[PDB]
Design a protein around this ligand. Sequence first.
Ligand SMILES: Cc1cc2c(-c3cncc(N)c3)cnc(N[C@@H]3CCNC[C@H]3OCC3CCS(=O)(=O)CC3)c2[nH]c1=O
Length: 127
Amino acid sequence: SMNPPPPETSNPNKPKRQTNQLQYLLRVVLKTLWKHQFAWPFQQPVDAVKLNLPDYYKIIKTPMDMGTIKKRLENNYYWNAQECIQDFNTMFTNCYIYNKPGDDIVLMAEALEKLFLQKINELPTEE
Ligand SMILES: Cc1cc2c(-c3cncc(N)c3)cnc(N[C@@H]3CCNC[C@H]3OCC3CCS(=O)(=O)CC3)c2[nH]c1=O
């Protein structure tokens, strides 16, 4: 029922890059999802205490949220685009794993995921 430590956004010994694909993931993908009307439940780690979801972190063992992704992108945490794309997919998948079909939160994740898929479809080639 307690909250775990959040996912790390800083790791000095992890090698990093700033690639055109990662720039796209921040400037286009993250920005688009972040401003969406349904972004709010996904802009920070799930607070299982405040939301009274005591089993959340029993079921979700790889938590991820856009607040974490935003920090990772802004602080150059990633080596490649695949790592970041995986984080987005983890976030959506967690929502579908934990909740029921037809739940508001699932409809919200689906709307964000649709836009995500449209933006990743036009991920630029590596310069
Ligand atoms: C990422 C995420 C956020 C989130 C938030 C959430 C919402 N807003 C903001 C934040 N930060 C989290 C709230 N509830 C969740 N799950 C619950 C439990 C399973 N079914 C759907 C939700 O049910 C709430 C239910 C309460 C009684 S009712 O009002 O009659 C009908 C709705 C969530 N699951 C998730 O995976």
